[PDB]
Amino acid sequence: SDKDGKKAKDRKEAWERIRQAIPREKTAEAKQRRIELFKKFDKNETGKLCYDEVYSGCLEVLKLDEFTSRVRDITKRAFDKSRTLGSKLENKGSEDFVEFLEFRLMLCYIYDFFELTVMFDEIDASGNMLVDEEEFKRAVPKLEAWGAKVEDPAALFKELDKNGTGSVTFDEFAAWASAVKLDADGDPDNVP
């Protein structure tokens, strides 16, 4: 009852829009789109967003539900992570709200996580949003190219297969790689 109801087709079509909708690039052009986007989320104009606010905007502004029927889950992941990377770049301790910086990083995280999902769709034979060992290994060079090297594929496969079922979930695989790409990319407003 927590299985994602979207198939590869649904994701591929939603990604056409989403990949254009989320301003993830390190350009001045995207930098402004991010402000515009942040104002749509920050209805209370506090410049601090709690999870329900981020979730509402993810739902109603970004329309993430086109891509996945688990908006809750992806939103929470992005919310948590962006809060953790925010601490780092500012060299301050973490807060339990998302200020503009973290919002920017959330946008990038969701972008990366969805981009990876669409990629994994191309390799998931069962259409169950899991990858077996063989499919995992075919993803590995595409990830290196996309910006997340797997130095030890067999070790990563074992580590991410949390309960030892012999597949890795899209959520675990995509969370690993987005966390790498995010921390790599950093603040996209910091441009060049």
Please state, as a whole number, how many other Cβ atoms lie within 10 Å of the Cβ of residue 122.
Answer: 12
Residue 183, annotated ligand binder? Answer: no
Instruction: Provide the domain limits for residue 127.
Output: 110-192
Residue 163, annotated ligand binder? Answer: yes
Residue 42, annotated ligand binder? Answer: yes
Q: Is the peptide bond preceding residue 23 cis, with omega within 30 degrees of 0?
A: no
Listing DSSP states for the chain in one string gives --S----HHHHHHHHHHHHHHS--SSSHHHHHHHHHHHHHH-TT-SS-B-HHHHHHHHHHTS-GGGT-S-HHHHHHHHHHHHHHHHHHHHTS---SSB-HHHHHHHHHHHHHHHHHHHHHHTT-SSSSSEEEHHHHHHHHHHHHHHT---S-HHHHHHHH-TTSSSEEEHHHHHHHHHHHHHHHH--TTS--
- From 76, 109, 142, give the residue that closes a domain: 109
Residues 130 and 75 in one domain: no
Residues 11 and 84 in one domain: yes
Residue 91, annotated ligand binder? Answer: no
The number of folded domains in the chain is 2
Which token pair is 35?
Answer: 């402000």
Which token pair is 156?
Answer: 């990563």
- What gap in Å lies between CA 24 and CA 188, rounded to an integer? 7
Residue 135, annotated ligand binder? Answer: yes
- From 80, 109, 138, give the residue that closes a domain: 109
Residue 122, annotated ligand binder? Answer: no
Residue 13, annotated ligand binder? Answer: no
Residue 45, annotated ligand binder? Answer: no
Residue 1, annotated ligand binder? Answer: no
Residues 2 and 86 in one domain: yes
Residues 117 and 105 in one domain: no
Residues 39 and 130 in one domain: no
Residues 115 and 62 in one domain: no
Please state, as a whole number, how many other Cβ atoms lie within 10 Å of the Cβ of residue 60.
Answer: 12
Residue 53, annotated ligand binder? Answer: yes
Residues 124 and 69 in one domain: no
Residues 83 and 128 in one domain: no
Residues 94 and 185 in one domain: no
Residue 159, annotated ligand binder? Answer: no
> What CATH number is attached to the domain comprising 65?
1.10.238.10
